[PDB]
């Protein structure tokens, strides 16, 4: 067929039950996430094909980086529980990437502070058992998969992507046969 498992996505052969529907794995220290994120804009041209009434998850992981990796798994936890997303993930990609300023949690939160998130609600958040929660949620996503390398999406709990299996000459048409591939497994 145009679609064939092996080829554009891969079958779990172990199921994940009661998964989020599109669930992208990333983390900040990740090269081709960078790229993911900032030329690819991957995450929005998926959002721009899915079927109605299909909502997008995105979690941080925990296996690069170390110490610095679990603090930004938390501080993705306060970006998801204030909803500021959109405001942190460009300064906190290029904060360990592109300038590399970020080597502590206290420059993590600068970056909040210079998104404007005042500092009482970026620590109360940081220290709630809201955000305890929600970093729960994103490692046992990762754990139920058994993650070891991002980026990663997981359509339902029953399909990951394979972009290895896929053009990359033109980048705009990498795009989206990855977004045009996730929508044909959202039908399935």
Same mark, same amino acid.
């Given at each position: 067929?145009? /679609?064939?498992?092996?080829?554009?996505?891969?079958?779990?052969? #172990? *199921?994940?039950?009661? %998964?989020?529907?599109?669930?992208?794995?990333?983390?900040?220290?990740?090269?081709?996430?960078?790229?993911?994120?900032? !030329?690819?804009?991957?995450?929005?041209?998926?959002?721009?094909?899915?079927?109605?009434?299909?909502?997008?998850?995105?979690?941080?992981?925990?296996?690069?980086?170390?110490?610095?990796? #679990?603090?930004?798994?938390?501080? &993705?936890? !306060?970006?998801?529980?204030?909803?500021?997303?959109?405001?942190?993930?460009?300064?906190?990609?290029?904060? !360990?990437?592109?300038?590399?300023?970020?080597?502590?949690? =206290?420059?993590?939160?600068?970056?909040?502070?210079? %998104?404007?998130?005042?500092?009482?609600? /970026?620590? +109360? +958040? &940081?220290?709630?058992?809201?955000?305890?929660?929600?970093? +729960?949620?994103?490692?046992?996503?990762? %754990?139920? !998969?058994?993650?070891?390398?991002? *980026? +990663?999406?997981?359509?339902?709990?029953?399909?990951?992507?394979?972009?290895?299996?896929?053009?990359? =000459?033109?980048?705009?048409?990498?795009?989206?046969?990855?977004?045009?591939?996730?929508? /044909?497994? =959202?039908? #399935?």
């Amino acid at each position: 067929a145009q /679609y064939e498992d092996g080829k554009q996505y891969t079958t779990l052969e #172990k *199921p994940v039950a009661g %998964a989020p529907q599109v669930l992208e794995f990333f983390s900040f220290f990740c090269p081709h996430c960078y790229q993911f994120e900032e !030329v690819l804009h991957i995450s929005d041209n998926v959002k721009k094909k899915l079927p109605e009434g299909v909502k997008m998850t995105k979690y941080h992981v925990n296996f690069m980086g170390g110490d610095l990796g #679990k603090d930004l798994t938390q501080a &993705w936890a !306060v970006a998801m529980a204030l909803g500021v997303e959109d405001k942190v993930t460009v300064p906190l990609f290029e904060g !360990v990437q592109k300038t590399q300023t970020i080597r502590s949690a =206290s420059d993590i939160r600068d970056v909040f502070i210079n %998104a404007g998130i005042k500092g009482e609600e /970026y620590d +109360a +958040a &940081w220290n709630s058992f809201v955000v305890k929660s929600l970093v +729960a949620q994103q490692e046992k996503a990762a %754990a139920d !998969v058994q993650l070891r390398g991002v *980026p +990663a999406m997981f359509v339902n709990g029953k399909y990951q992507l394979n972009p290895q299996g896929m053009d990359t =000459s033109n980048m705009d048409v990498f795009v989206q046969q990855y977004a045009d591939t996730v929508k /044909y497994l =959202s039908e #399935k």
